Amino acid sequence: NTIPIGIALAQTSNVALLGQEQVAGAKIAEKYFNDKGGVNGTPIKLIFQDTAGDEAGTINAFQTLINKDKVVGIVGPTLSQQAFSANPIAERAKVPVVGPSNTAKGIPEIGDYVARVSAPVSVVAPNSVKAALKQNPNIKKVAVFFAQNDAFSKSETEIFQQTVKDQGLELVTVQKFQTTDTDFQSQATNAINLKPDLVIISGLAADGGNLVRQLRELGYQGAIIGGDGLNTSNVFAVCKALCDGVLIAQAYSPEYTGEINKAFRQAYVDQYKKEPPQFSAQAFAAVQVYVESLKALDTKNKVSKIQLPELRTELNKQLLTGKYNTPLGEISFTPIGEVVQKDFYVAQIKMEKDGSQGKFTFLK
Numbered sequence: 001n002t003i004p005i006g007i008a009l010a011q012t013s014n015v016a017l018l019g020q021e022q023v024a025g026a027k028i029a030e031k032y033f034n035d036k037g038g039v040n041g042t043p044i045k046l047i048f049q050d051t052a053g054d055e056a057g058t059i060n061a062f063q064t065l066i067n068k069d070k071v072v073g074i075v076g077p078t079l080s081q082q083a084f085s086a087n088p089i090a091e092r093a094k095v096p097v098v099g100p101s102n103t104a105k106g107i108p109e110i111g112d113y114v115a116r117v118s119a120p121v122s123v124v125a126p127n128s129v130k131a132a133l134k135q136n137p138n139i140k141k142v143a144v145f146f147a148q149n150d151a152f153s154k155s156e157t158e159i160f161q162q163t164v165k166d167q168g169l170e171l172v173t174v175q176k177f178q179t180t181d182t183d184f185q186s187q188a189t190n191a192i193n194l195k196p197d198l199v200i201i202s203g204l205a206a207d208g209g210n211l212v213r214q215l216r217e218l219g220y221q222g223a224i225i226g227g228d229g230l231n232t233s234n235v236f237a238v239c240k241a242l243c244d245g246v247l248i249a250q251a252y253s254p255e256y257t258g259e260i261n262k263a264f265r266q267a268y269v270d271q272y273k274k275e276p277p278q279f280s281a282q283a284f285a286a287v288q289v290y291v292e293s294l295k296a297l298d299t300k301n302k303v304s305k306i307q308l309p310e311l312r313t314e315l316n317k318q319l320l321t322g323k324y325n326t327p328l329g330e331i332s333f334t335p336i337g338e339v340v341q342k343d344f345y346v347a348q349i350k351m352e353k354d355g356s357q358g359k360f361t362f363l364k
């Protein structure tokens with residue numbers, strides 16, 4: 001006998017360039033928590049249902065988890081774009097959702113059953129602009145690019161644009177693209193002709209990486225900031241040596257000294273031979289929220305005896321009140337399901353000259 005928790009993430013499509021890192025974190029969490037006895041002796045069972053890359057696939061995954069798989073709660077989905085369409089399904093069904101990495105403005109406001117462990121674009125994105133200005137105080141002109149078909153990218157670009165203005169910089173252009181585009185010659189050239197000192201990109205991984213590469217190919221030599229959708233080593237294959245120097249804000253640090261992070265990091269490094277990515281840590285933290293909430297609930301009200309609809313409602317109520325020492329640091333929730341989290345960072349892509357290998361170097 002086990003307690004089923006649904007994991008609805010992008011395991012296929014180009015969205016899996018982000019989703020697979022989340023899956024990795026969730027699987028590490030399952031072993032970590034089950035090795036500690038699960039929920040007061042009862043193992044959890046993560047049930048994975050692939051969302052693919054669109055809204056319909058996410059809705060289908062959620063409905064399957066809720067109805068067929070009888071899950072007590074869902075971790076997911078990968079994208080804010082997917083969350084805005086699918087989360088209302090879970091809200092209506094009174095099934096809790098904990099988003100690992102969705103950072104668009106407005107997600108917890110979807111309803112009483114929607115929470116997230118990822119701080120939103122408003123507190124994550126500005127740090128990377130500040131980091132760029134530290135590395136080059138003479139930046140004056142900024143070109144901004146965003147994926148106009150993606151909800152998170154639109155939310156993130158608004159924050160980047162406001163930060164550029166607040167830092168007293170000149171916004172020379174805002175260029176639009178689609179996440180499904182591979183060619184950006186026209187937008188890149190448009191921006192390059194305006195002589196920017198800094199370029200900021202809000203898109204996802206394949207698109208963001210292709211744009212970074214093309215900017216460099218077309219002769220751009222200035223600074224580049226990538227938003228959260230580019231925050232994966234999966235971009236390395238796309239821009240290769242030309243990824244070098246890209247600045248990306250982080251909501252997780254491998255070097256954070258929390259005991260659980262040490263355990264998580266050690267488990268990750270031993271398996272994957274590199275530091276745990278943000279998306280992996282965030283997924284771990286979302287599973288942790290469910291495990292620790294289930295334990296607290298079970299102690300007060302034995303879960304094996306609670307019928308499913310009431311169990312879901314009580315679990316949702318419980319998780320919102322909890323305090324969690326996670327790989328992301330000590331976190332909790334506001335009454336609306338927004339995360340409370342203290343520390344943020346910026347890292348910079350450092351590629352080896354040959355372009356076949358790289359890493360994220362954390363700025364001090």
Ligand SMILES: [Mg+2]
Binds near residue numbers: 108111336
């Ligand atoms: Mg909420």
